[PDB]
Amino acid sequence: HAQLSSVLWTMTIQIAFGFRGFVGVFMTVALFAMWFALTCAVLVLMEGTSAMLHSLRLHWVESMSKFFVGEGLPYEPFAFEYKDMEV
Amino acid sequence: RPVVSTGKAWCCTVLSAFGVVILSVIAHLFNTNHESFVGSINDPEDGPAVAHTVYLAALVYLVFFVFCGFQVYLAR
Amino acid sequence: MTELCPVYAPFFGAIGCASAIIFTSLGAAYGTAKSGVGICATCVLRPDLLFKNIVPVIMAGIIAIYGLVVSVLVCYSLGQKQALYTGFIQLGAGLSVGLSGLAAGFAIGIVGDAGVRGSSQQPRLFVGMILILIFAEVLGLYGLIVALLLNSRATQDVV
Amino acid sequence: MSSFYTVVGVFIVVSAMSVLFWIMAPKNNQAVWRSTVILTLAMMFLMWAITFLCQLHPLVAPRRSDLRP
Amino acid sequence: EKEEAIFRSAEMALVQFYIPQEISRDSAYTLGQLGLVQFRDLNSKVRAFQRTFVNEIRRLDNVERQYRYFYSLLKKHDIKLYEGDTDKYLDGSGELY
Amino acid sequence: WAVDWVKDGKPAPGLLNMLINMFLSPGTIDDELYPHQAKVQVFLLLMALV
Amino acid sequence: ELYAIAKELDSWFQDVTREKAIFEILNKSNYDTNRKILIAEGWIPRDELATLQARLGEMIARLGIDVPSIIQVLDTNHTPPTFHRTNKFTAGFQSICDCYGIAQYREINAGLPTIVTFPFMFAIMFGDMGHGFLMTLAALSLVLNEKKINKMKRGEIFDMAFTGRYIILLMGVFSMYTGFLYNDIFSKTMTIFKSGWKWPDHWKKGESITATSVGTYPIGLDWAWHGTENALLFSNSYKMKLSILMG
């Protein structure tokens, strides 16, 4: 994550650091418009999503090995509860 | 509703809001020196004062930001 | 240059590091190709079981970085003025770890793609499934352990 | 502070606060805090404990971004 | 009192019943209101067609059939439904009322 | 963090590797980490057999 | 006719459903002709061993002739079930904990450990102030607007995403914490905690100007570690050591 963030930052911000103020202002505007979208969506979403379940499974395999000596059995106490269906 | 906001107006507002805080900090680190974006053997050198361009960049963002705010504030 | 630090010894670092990365990458890809298609049946059959089914592919993922870590580790041991002895040992370690990971991916995927079916009718069958599966990435771990030893011998012994 | 005495001296505050709040806590969900907050703070302490840099062996990184700011 | 039961695990006490049938259905609200419980049914070795309630549910189900029949025609022409107003208040939080 | 071998001149182990000294070699430190290690290394290795 | 009926058919459907359900519940019981005795069994919380009898008090005063209809119990060795609750504040946490599996009676469940543990390990995955900041802002908007949005439906997966505001915020707080611990706004440093490193004032543009430990910030890891790849090696070795330690 550190390397990918750094390389994206370089190849966007430093390019934006190029000196052109007449129409290059529009160049930098478009550059940042792209960079923000990338660095949020394609740089966070899949990363974190793929990341969390790793820790989750590690917790499972490194603790439940010592905690689940077995499985219990569910209860979910019931009562009258509202439902709605339509055709 | 003066103007339709469902046309991804929230996107314009948020991006415009985020497109000025960065301008502030880059202007600061241009005028100021942190040897991280203005001072280096390879740093492009127009002097540590190019904050004019970034200061200019804010207005175009803010125009659309406020214009979309006008239509979207009715939902709060 | 000389037989101790010639012009071709740096080539070992130039290439030797890119070995394990590719073997583990291909092993993980093959493991996915095998197991992932498995969900496509049971999900429609019984969407209930959707979590227990994913463990093997993530085990393959765990293996997938065994090669990347060693590659980046040795990435500094190389240079234009290193010794060909270091290149030899680095190449040997990278090949060993990467191919071992590829074999682990083979074994884990080719068993998970069927364990997905096995557990479909028996939601609690995965008890032995995990017991069998763990061995594959454990074997990958033995595959990668000796790379550290050789690189330690590759970061202090030269010429 | 920064020395070998620093960590050993500062380990006591977390234990003191835990035992304190292990006795007193919000009545609603009385035991959830009594069970969780201790680790909630111990985690803080423990990952800070390692970033503490002092008495270091290896070399520092040479810099190559010099232009006389 | 309150037991976390998430740093531990729980246990629900079974109860023996010899309730006379004379309060069979009028007492339905007893557990219909806030029953918040589970059962271990004893009716085994005998099936719907072999048990009793099957008979009335056979007359009941027809009403649901005709209701969902109506729903199509109701939505058919131009109009909507106010939805269950009871659902907002009748199922108001958890009540004994 | 306990002790530095270059702030005060002393032999040092590798940045991370001090391992095989326990396993193949019985009760040898061979890396200058701490004196009583030479004696307690065999103990640490041995109480895991029974 | 349609106007008149519409206002009430929905209520009628609710009814039929409710009485239907209770009829099946009744159907879960036993009857006999000669002896007027009804039979059923339900498992009651250990802590509710007496309150629900007072509750049966709410179905006697006028609805049953001082009717518990039974209060004496004969118990069987059949394994009573267990239970766990999410404390109405960490639903997603415990749900994801238990969907993987369950455990036997009176055993220490691991629901609470997950809440404190998992989010920080996820956080240290990226540890960037901007990233965690934006995602926590999204989670804050979600939890603020759920006062009205909880009822409107979303995309099938978008609904589940809505269902995890607490989890998102918990991971994000640790994300900012670790990112600040690492001084990286997209791998960018802002530290003014200079503590002393050999930086000779005379440098040739290109000369490998090195340094040495002439003073350390107690936290360390400051901007000064932004240099040659020696910085990368130091950081990576330190981080792998930290991972081993925490593990």
XYZ file of N, CA, C and O in Angstrom, chain G residues 4-175:
688
model
N -62.930 1.692 -0.589
C -63.333 1.289 0.753
C -62.486 0.126 1.253
O -61.987 0.144 2.384
N -62.300 -0.891 0.415
C -61.663 -2.120 0.877
C -60.177 -1.903 1.126
O -59.624 -2.399 2.116
N -59.509 -1.143 0.253
C -58.057 -1.033 0.331
C -57.600 -0.667 1.734
O -56.625 -1.227 2.247
N -58.318 0.243 2.390
C -57.879 0.730 3.691
C -57.807 -0.379 4.730
O -57.162 -0.200 5.768
N -58.442 -1.519 4.471
C -58.638 -2.546 5.480
C -58.130 -3.921 5.078
O -57.854 -4.741 5.963
N -57.990 -4.199 3.781
C -57.496 -5.513 3.376
C -56.097 -5.772 3.920
O -55.771 -6.902 4.295
N -55.242 -4.750 3.940
C -53.897 -4.934 4.476
C -53.946 -5.339 5.944
O -53.248 -6.267 6.373
N -54.768 -4.646 6.732
C -54.956 -5.035 8.122
C -55.420 -6.477 8.214
O -54.945 -7.247 9.059
N -56.353 -6.856 7.348
C -56.889 -8.207 7.394
C -55.804 -9.229 7.101
O -55.777 -10.313 7.694
N -54.919 -8.912 6.158
C -53.809 -9.804 5.852
C -52.881 -9.940 7.051
O -52.443 -11.044 7.397
N -52.565 -8.817 7.695
C -51.761 -8.883 8.910
C -52.408 -9.828 9.905
O -51.748 -10.687 10.504
N -53.715 -9.687 10.073
C -54.455 -10.523 10.997
C -54.241 -11.977 10.614
O -53.540 -12.719 11.310
N -54.781 -12.360 9.458
C -54.744 -13.761 9.058
C -53.352 -14.325 9.263
O -53.189 -15.432 9.783
N -52.323 -13.562 8.901
C -50.963 -14.028 9.128
C -50.726 -14.315 10.606
O -50.197 -15.371 10.971
N -51.124 -13.383 11.471
C -50.800 -13.501 12.889
C -51.530 -14.681 13.526
O -50.921 -15.520 14.210
N -52.845 -14.756 13.318
C -53.579 -15.908 13.839
C -53.102 -17.215 13.218
O -53.063 -18.238 13.905
N -52.719 -17.208 11.943
C -52.139 -18.398 11.340
C -50.922 -18.851 12.129
O -50.812 -20.020 12.525
N -49.993 -17.923 12.356
C -48.764 -18.245 13.068
C -49.070 -18.841 14.429
O -48.527 -19.887 14.801
N -49.947 -18.187 15.191
C -50.241 -18.705 16.517
C -50.919 -20.056 16.421
O -50.756 -20.895 17.309
N -51.701 -20.288 15.368
C -52.313 -21.597 15.207
C -51.259 -22.668 15.006
O -51.352 -23.746 15.596
N -50.245 -22.398 14.187
C -49.168 -23.381 14.089
C -48.467 -23.558 15.428
O -48.139 -24.687 15.815
N -48.234 -22.462 16.151
C -47.595 -22.574 17.458
C -48.393 -23.516 18.347
O -47.843 -24.438 18.961
N -49.706 -23.307 18.415
C -50.581 -24.245 19.103
C -50.383 -25.652 18.565
O -50.299 -26.620 19.329
N -50.294 -25.772 17.243
C -50.132 -27.063 16.600
C -48.864 -27.759 17.064
O -48.752 -28.982 16.933
N -47.912 -27.003 17.600
C -46.702 -27.561 18.184
C -46.939 -28.194 19.555
O -45.964 -28.494 20.255
N -48.192 -28.393 19.963
C -48.521 -28.938 21.272
C -49.361 -30.200 21.115
O -49.699 -30.615 20.003
N -49.708 -30.804 22.252
C -50.402 -32.084 22.294
C -51.732 -31.957 23.026
O -51.889 -31.132 23.932
N -52.689 -32.798 22.625
C -54.023 -32.815 23.205
C -54.452 -34.250 23.472
O -53.998 -35.185 22.808
N -55.336 -34.413 24.456
C -55.979 -35.688 24.735
C -57.414 -35.436 25.172
O -57.720 -34.397 25.762
N -58.292 -36.399 24.882
C -59.717 -36.207 25.134
C -60.073 -36.507 26.585
O -60.671 -35.673 27.274
N -59.724 -37.701 27.066
C -60.162 -38.115 28.395
C -59.628 -37.182 29.476
O -60.364 -36.797 30.391
N -58.354 -36.807 29.390
C -57.730 -35.914 30.360
C -57.566 -34.541 29.725
O -56.944 -34.415 28.666
N -58.120 -33.515 30.369
C -58.021 -32.150 29.856
C -56.656 -31.591 30.242
O -56.503 -30.807 31.181
N -55.642 -32.010 29.492
C -54.265 -31.612 29.744
C -53.596 -31.271 28.419
O -53.680 -32.034 27.451
N -52.935 -30.118 28.384
C -52.196 -29.633 27.229
C -50.704 -29.671 27.535
O -50.278 -29.376 28.654
N -49.909 -30.043 26.534
C -48.491 -30.322 26.729
C -47.674 -29.491 25.751
O -47.993 -29.438 24.557
N -46.624 -28.850 26.258
C -45.661 -28.136 25.431
C -44.424 -27.862 26.276
O -44.468 -27.914 27.507
N -43.312 -27.568 25.602
C -42.064 -27.274 26.297
C -41.364 -26.103 25.625
O -41.243 -26.069 24.398
N -40.904 -25.161 26.438
C -40.061 -24.085 25.958
C -38.965 -23.794 26.961
O -39.158 -23.896 28.172
N -37.803 -23.420 26.437
C -36.610 -23.218 27.246
C -36.488 -21.740 27.585
O -36.543 -20.887 26.694
N -36.323 -21.448 28.866
C -36.469 -20.101 29.413
C -35.097 -19.622 29.867
O -34.314 -20.429 30.377
N -34.777 -18.335 29.737
C -33.448 -17.870 30.151
C -33.157 -18.208 31.605
O -34.026 -18.116 32.474
N -31.910 -18.610 31.858
C -31.494 -18.935 33.215
C -31.777 -17.791 34.174
O -32.233 -18.019 35.300
N -31.520 -16.556 33.747
C -31.734 -15.398 34.604
C -33.208 -15.054 34.770
O -33.571 -14.405 35.757
N -34.060 -15.478 33.839
C -35.491 -15.216 33.903
C -36.242 -16.288 34.681
O -37.436 -16.495 34.441
N -35.570 -16.964 35.614
C -36.158 -18.123 36.274
C -37.427 -17.785 37.047
O -38.209 -18.692 37.351
N -37.650 -16.513 37.379
C -38.820 -16.118 38.157
C -39.598 -14.944 37.578
O -40.807 -14.858 37.825
N -38.961 -14.045 36.822
C -39.673 -12.880 36.303
C -40.812 -13.280 35.375
O -41.901 -12.700 35.448
N -40.585 -14.254 34.495
C -41.641 -14.668 33.584
C -42.818 -15.295 34.316
O -43.920 -15.326 33.771
N -42.624 -15.774 35.545
C -43.769 -16.206 36.340
C -44.609 -15.012 36.774
O -45.844 -15.042 36.693
N -43.959 -13.934 37.210
C -44.691 -12.691 37.407
C -45.398 -12.273 36.125
O -46.526 -11.768 36.171
N -44.758 -12.490 34.975
C -45.395 -12.170 33.702
C -46.641 -13.018 33.484
O -47.678 -12.507 33.047
N -46.566 -14.314 33.790
C -47.774 -15.128 33.836
C -48.795 -14.507 34.772
O -50.000 -14.719 34.607
N -48.322 -13.766 35.768
C -49.219 -12.958 36.570
C -50.031 -11.976 35.744
O -51.132 -11.589 36.141
N -49.508 -11.559 34.589
C -50.228 -10.633 33.718
C -51.277 -11.319 32.855
O -51.971 -10.633 32.096
N -51.404 -12.639 32.940
C -52.381 -13.398 32.169
C -53.290 -14.226 33.072
O -53.798 -15.274 32.670
N -53.535 -13.753 34.295
C -54.402 -14.437 35.248
C -55.513 -13.524 35.755
O -56.695 -13.885 35.708
N -55.157 -12.318 36.205
C -56.075 -11.484 36.970
C -57.491 -11.590 36.440
O -58.457 -11.623 37.205
N -57.630 -11.657 35.130
C -58.943 -11.815 34.542
C -58.958 -12.767 33.361
O -60.031 -13.010 32.808
N -57.822 -13.324 32.963
C -57.760 -14.159 31.774
C -57.550 -15.626 32.087
O -57.618 -16.454 31.174
N -57.293 -15.967 33.340
C -57.142 -17.352 33.733
C -57.324 -17.479 35.226
O -56.823 -16.640 35.980
N -58.020 -18.518 35.677
C -58.399 -18.582 37.081
C -57.133 -18.859 37.875
O -56.745 -20.016 38.064
N -56.506 -17.792 38.373
C -55.191 -17.870 39.006
C -54.318 -18.872 38.260
O -53.776 -19.816 38.838
N -54.201 -18.668 36.951
C -53.731 -19.699 36.030
C -52.247 -19.472 35.749
O -51.912 -18.632 34.897
N -51.334 -20.192 36.416
C -50.048 -20.491 35.780
C -50.233 -21.665 34.841
O -49.629 -21.763 33.769
N -51.094 -22.574 35.294
C -51.426 -23.828 34.638
C -50.287 -24.830 34.771
O -50.475 -26.025 34.523
N -49.105 -24.351 35.156
C -48.066 -25.164 35.772
C -46.951 -24.220 36.195
O -46.677 -23.229 35.509
N -46.304 -24.506 37.319
C -45.078 -23.795 37.656
C -44.017 -24.787 38.111
O -42.829 -24.455 38.164
N -44.431 -26.009 38.436
C -43.480 -27.031 38.839
C -42.859 -27.669 37.606
O -43.546 -27.940 36.617
N -41.553 -27.907 37.669
C -40.777 -28.350 36.519
C -40.048 -29.637 36.865
O -39.470 -29.764 37.951
N -40.085 -30.591 35.943
C -39.182 -31.731 35.949
C -38.178 -31.530 34.825
O -38.565 -31.255 33.684
N -36.894 -31.641 35.152
C -35.819 -31.341 34.221
C -35.230 -32.624 33.652
O -35.248 -33.677 34.296
N -34.711 -32.520 32.433
C -34.084 -33.629 31.733
C -32.647 -33.268 31.377
O -32.299 -32.097 31.204
N -31.814 -34.301 31.261
C -30.404 -34.120 30.938
C -30.176 -33.549 29.545
O -29.019 -33.312 29.181
N -31.229 -33.324 28.762
C -31.057 -32.788 27.419
C -30.310 -31.465 27.472
O -30.668 -30.563 28.235
N -29.277 -31.350 26.647
C -28.401 -30.189 26.647
C -29.199 -28.918 26.385
O -29.680 -28.712 25.264
N -29.367 -28.043 27.376
C -30.033 -26.774 27.109
C -29.227 -25.950 26.126
O -27.983 -26.017 26.108
N -29.889 -25.161 25.283
C -29.146 -24.329 24.331
C -28.482 -23.146 25.016
O -28.813 -22.773 26.143
N -27.526 -22.554 24.309
C -26.883 -21.329 24.748
C -27.373 -20.160 23.903
O -28.208 -20.308 23.007
N -26.837 -18.977 24.187
C -27.253 -17.775 23.486
C -26.125 -16.760 23.557
O -25.228 -16.860 24.397
N -26.174 -15.788 22.649
C -25.314 -14.620 22.715
C -26.071 -13.434 22.138
O -26.926 -13.603 21.265
N -25.760 -12.242 22.637
C -26.373 -11.006 22.179
C -25.288 -10.003 21.809
O -24.165 -10.063 22.318
N -25.634 -9.083 20.912
C -24.685 -8.104 20.399
C -24.740 -6.771 21.135
O -24.048 -5.831 20.730
N -25.549 -6.660 22.186
C -25.612 -5.448 22.999
C -26.101 -4.248 22.194
O -25.698 -3.112 22.454
N -26.929 -4.500 21.179
C -27.644 -3.455 20.449
C -26.728 -2.329 19.980
O -27.203 -1.236 19.658
N -25.422 -2.581 19.935
C -24.470 -1.558 19.527
C -23.375 -2.081 18.611
O -22.682 -1.270 17.990
N -23.201 -3.393 18.497
C -22.118 -3.986 17.725
C -22.657 -5.155 16.911
O -22.037 -6.214 16.805
N -23.843 -4.965 16.329
C -24.531 -6.063 15.657
C -23.632 -6.732 14.627
O -23.476 -7.958 14.625
N -23.028 -5.940 13.740
C -22.190 -6.522 12.706
C -21.013 -7.286 13.278
O -20.681 -8.377 12.805
N -20.364 -6.726 14.300
C -19.239 -7.411 14.928
C -19.613 -8.838 15.303
O -19.034 -9.806 14.796
N -20.598 -8.985 16.191
C -20.937 -10.307 16.697
C -21.530 -11.184 15.606
O -21.325 -12.402 15.604
N -22.287 -10.592 14.681
C -22.862 -11.377 13.595
C -21.768 -12.036 12.769
O -21.826 -13.236 12.479
N -20.757 -11.260 12.376
C -19.663 -11.829 11.602
C -18.845 -12.783 12.459
O -18.279 -13.756 11.947
N -18.756 -12.529 13.764
C -18.055 -13.463 14.637
C -18.722 -14.832 14.620
O -18.064 -15.858 14.412
N -20.035 -14.864 14.829
C -20.754 -16.114 15.030
C -21.120 -16.819 13.733
O -21.255 -18.047 13.739
N -21.292 -16.092 12.625
C -21.634 -16.765 11.378
C -20.564 -17.775 10.993
O -20.868 -18.789 10.355
N -19.313 -17.519 11.374
C -18.258 -18.496 11.148
C -18.485 -19.760 11.965
O -18.039 -20.842 11.567
N -19.167 -19.648 13.093
C -19.437 -20.802 13.923
C -19.874 -20.377 15.307
O -20.024 -19.192 15.607
N -20.071 -21.384 16.152
C -20.534 -21.208 17.520
C -19.720 -22.124 18.426
O -18.782 -22.793 17.986
N -20.070 -22.137 19.711
C -19.339 -22.914 20.701
C -20.312 -23.450 21.741
O -21.489 -23.086 21.769
N -19.792 -24.303 22.622
C -20.617 -25.042 23.570
C -21.059 -24.132 24.718
O -20.856 -22.916 24.700
N -21.686 -24.727 25.731
C -22.325 -23.970 26.796
C -21.302 -23.415 27.776
O -20.235 -23.998 27.983
N -21.643 -22.279 28.383
C -20.857 -21.660 29.447
C -19.384 -21.519 29.079
O -18.528 -21.413 29.963
N -19.072 -21.509 27.788
C -17.716 -21.310 27.304
C -17.499 -19.839 26.985
O -18.428 -19.126 26.600
N -16.254 -19.396 27.119
C -15.916 -18.009 26.834
C -16.036 -17.767 25.338
O -15.185 -18.204 24.555
N -17.089 -17.067 24.931
C -17.213 -16.676 23.538
C -16.245 -15.541 23.230
O -15.871 -14.756 24.105
N -15.829 -15.465 21.967
C -14.831 -14.499 21.526
C -15.461 -13.314 20.801
O -14.814 -12.677 19.969
N -16.718 -12.997 21.116
C -17.360 -11.866 20.466
C -16.669 -10.551 20.768
O -16.361 -9.773 19.860
N -16.411 -10.285 22.047
C -15.791 -9.015 22.421
C -14.387 -8.864 21.858
O -14.078 -7.791 21.311
N -13.502 -9.860 21.943
C -12.145 -9.670 21.409
C -12.113 -9.168 19.978
O -11.236 -8.361 19.645
N -13.031 -9.619 19.122
C -13.003 -9.202 17.724
C -13.123 -7.690 17.606
O -12.369 -7.051 16.862
N -14.048 -7.101 18.368
C -14.361 -5.683 18.224
C -13.116 -4.836 18.417
O -12.882 -3.880 17.668
N -12.300 -5.164 19.411
C -11.101 -4.399 19.722
C -9.931 -4.816 18.843
O -9.085 -3.993 18.492
N -9.868 -6.094 18.465
C -8.693 -6.598 17.764
C -8.755 -6.289 16.274
O -7.919 -5.544 15.749
N -9.752 -6.834 15.583
C -9.743 -6.811 14.121
C -9.562 -5.417 13.541
O -8.740 -5.252 12.617
N -10.279 -4.391 14.003
C -10.203 -3.095 13.316
C -8.797 -2.534 13.239
O -8.449 -1.919 12.227
N -7.963 -2.739 14.260
C -6.632 -2.140 14.223
C -5.717 -2.863 13.242
O -4.924 -2.223 12.539
N -5.776 -4.196 13.203
C -5.000 -4.905 12.194
C -5.441 -4.518 10.795
O -4.599 -4.363 9.905
N -6.744 -4.340 10.571
C -7.149 -3.799 9.279
C -6.575 -2.405 9.065
O -6.119 -2.074 7.965
N -6.601 -1.570 10.103
C -6.150 -0.190 9.969
C -4.695 -0.121 9.529
O -4.344 0.656 8.634
N -3.839 -0.933 10.140
C -2.408 -0.875 9.864
C -2.120 -1.401 8.461
O -0.970 -1.386 8.008
N -3.155 -1.880 7.767
C -2.976 -2.349 6.396
C -2.556 -1.216 5.470
O -1.707 -1.406 4.592
N -3.159 -0.041 5.633
C -2.826 1.142 4.849
C -2.356 2.293 5.721
O -1.349 2.937 5.402
N -3.059 2.573 6.816
C -2.644 3.602 7.748
C -2.350 4.937 7.099
O -1.220 5.428 7.159
N -3.359 5.531 6.470
C -3.220 6.834 5.841
C -4.296 7.759 6.383
O -5.472 7.388 6.441
N -3.888 8.967 6.775
C -4.845 9.906 7.348
C -5.947 10.242 6.355
O -7.126 10.268 6.716
N -5.589 10.497 5.096
C -6.609 10.836 4.115
C -7.599 9.709 3.894
O -8.813 9.925 3.856
N -7.090 8.485 3.759
C -7.945 7.342 3.464
C -8.939 7.106 4.594
O -10.163 7.095 4.386
N -8.414 6.900 5.803
C -9.275 6.694 6.950
C -10.203 7.867 7.183
O -11.358 7.690 7.566
N -9.706 9.083 6.962
C -10.525 10.273 7.140
C -11.738 10.239 6.221
O -12.874 10.430 6.667
N -11.516 9.983 4.932
C -12.627 9.956 3.988
C -13.611 8.842 4.321
O -14.833 9.053 4.308
N -13.104 7.647 4.624
C -14.015 6.536 4.887
C -14.792 6.747 6.183
O -15.983 6.420 6.251
N -14.152 7.305 7.212
C -14.870 7.637 8.435
C -15.883 8.744 8.203
O -16.936 8.752 8.841
N -15.581 9.698 7.322
C -16.574 10.708 6.978
C -17.793 10.064 6.334
O -18.937 10.412 6.654
N -17.562 9.116 5.425
C -18.678 8.399 4.821
C -19.479 7.648 5.878
O -20.716 7.668 5.865
N -18.789 6.987 6.810
C -19.483 6.252 7.864
C -20.267 7.191 8.772
O -21.367 6.852 9.227
N -19.705 8.363 9.072
C -20.414 9.348 9.879
C -21.675 9.815 9.175
O -22.736 9.929 9.795
N -21.576 10.096 7.875
C -22.765 10.460 7.117
C -23.794 9.342 7.166
O -24.993 9.593 7.327
N -23.338 8.097 7.036
C -24.249 6.959 7.075
C -24.984 6.890 8.407
O -26.214 6.771 8.448
N -24.240 6.956 9.512
C -24.853 6.802 10.827
C -25.702 8.016 11.175
O -26.639 7.916 11.976
N -25.389 9.180 10.610
C -26.223 10.353 10.835
C -27.534 10.244 10.070
O -28.606 10.529 10.615
N -27.467 9.826 8.807
C -28.655 9.779 7.968
C -29.500 8.539 8.207
O -30.652 8.511 7.767
N -28.978 7.523 8.898
C -29.767 6.317 9.111
C -31.028 6.581 9.918
O -31.929 5.736 9.914
N -31.117 7.720 10.606
C -32.355 8.065 11.291
C -33.540 8.060 10.338
O -34.666 7.778 10.764
N -33.310 8.360 9.062
C -34.334 8.272 8.034
C -34.055 7.199 6.995
O -35.000 6.630 6.451
N -32.786 6.901 6.718
C -32.445 5.956 5.660
C -32.578 4.510 6.109
O -32.654 3.613 5.261
N -32.615 4.253 7.418
C -32.719 2.875 7.885
C -33.931 2.176 7.286
O -33.909 0.955 7.092
N -34.991 2.925 6.984
C -36.198 2.326 6.432
C -36.147 2.177 4.917
O -36.568 1.137 4.400
N -35.654 3.175 4.189
C -35.528 3.016 2.747
C -34.521 1.921 2.417
O -33.492 1.767 3.079
N -34.836 1.153 1.380
C -33.994 0.054 0.944
C -32.858 0.560 0.061
O -32.915 1.645 -0.519
N -31.808 -0.253 -0.026
C -30.649 0.058 -0.850
C -30.372 -1.104 -1.793
O -31.159 -2.053 -1.862
N -29.264 -1.039 -2.527
C -28.803 -2.213 -3.241
C -28.566 -3.368 -2.289
O -28.188 -3.179 -1.131
N -28.794 -4.586 -2.789
C -28.756 -5.757 -1.919
C -27.480 -5.786 -1.091
O -27.519 -6.031 0.120
N -26.339 -5.524 -1.723
C -25.092 -5.408 -0.980
C -24.955 -4.024 -0.352
O -24.302 -3.879 0.687
N -25.551 -3.004 -0.968
C -25.514 -1.668 -0.388
C -26.243 -1.630 0.949
O -25.839 -0.898 1.859
N -27.303 -2.428 1.099
C -27.977 -2.522 2.389
C -27.039 -3.077 3.453
O -26.922 -2.522 4.555
N -26.353 -4.178 3.141
C -25.410 -4.740 4.101
C -24.314 -3.738 4.428
O -23.906 -3.606 5.588
N -23.826 -3.018 3.417
C -22.844 -1.971 3.668
C -23.384 -0.950 4.659
O -22.691 -0.566 5.608
N -24.625 -0.505 4.457
C -25.259 0.382 5.428
C -25.261 -0.244 6.815
O -25.134 0.458 7.824
N -25.403 -1.556 6.881
C -25.492 -2.244 8.171
C -24.164 -2.261 8.957
O -24.148 -2.954 9.981
N -23.086 -1.577 8.573
C -21.822 -1.703 9.279
C -21.165 -0.391 9.664
O -19.938 -0.263 9.587
N -21.967 0.595 10.073
C -21.412 1.903 10.410
C -20.451 1.815 11.591
O -19.372 2.420 11.568
N -20.830 1.076 12.638
C -19.949 0.942 13.793
C -18.619 0.322 13.390
O -17.554 0.793 13.801
N -18.665 -0.734 12.578
C -17.445 -1.421 12.171
C -16.566 -0.491 11.347
O -15.343 -0.427 11.538
N -17.176 0.247 10.419
C -16.408 1.147 9.566
C -15.735 2.221 10.408
O -14.548 2.519 10.239
N -16.482 2.818 11.336
C -15.899 3.864 12.169
C -14.786 3.309 13.048
O -13.745 3.954 13.234
N -14.989 2.112 13.605
C -13.979 1.519 14.474
C -12.692 1.236 13.714
O -11.594 1.473 14.232
N -12.795 0.709 12.494
C -11.582 0.496 11.714
C -10.942 1.824 11.326
O -9.712 1.957 11.347
N -11.756 2.822 10.982
C -11.203 4.084 10.524
C -10.449 4.832 11.606
O -9.425 5.468 11.334
N -10.953 4.800 12.840
C -10.246 5.492 13.914
C -8.839 4.930 14.060
O -7.856 5.678 14.146
N -8.716 3.603 14.053
C -7.398 2.990 14.122
C -6.583 3.298 12.878
O -5.354 3.393 12.951
N -7.242 3.440 11.728
C -6.520 3.799 10.512
C -5.835 5.147 10.674
O -4.637 5.285 10.398
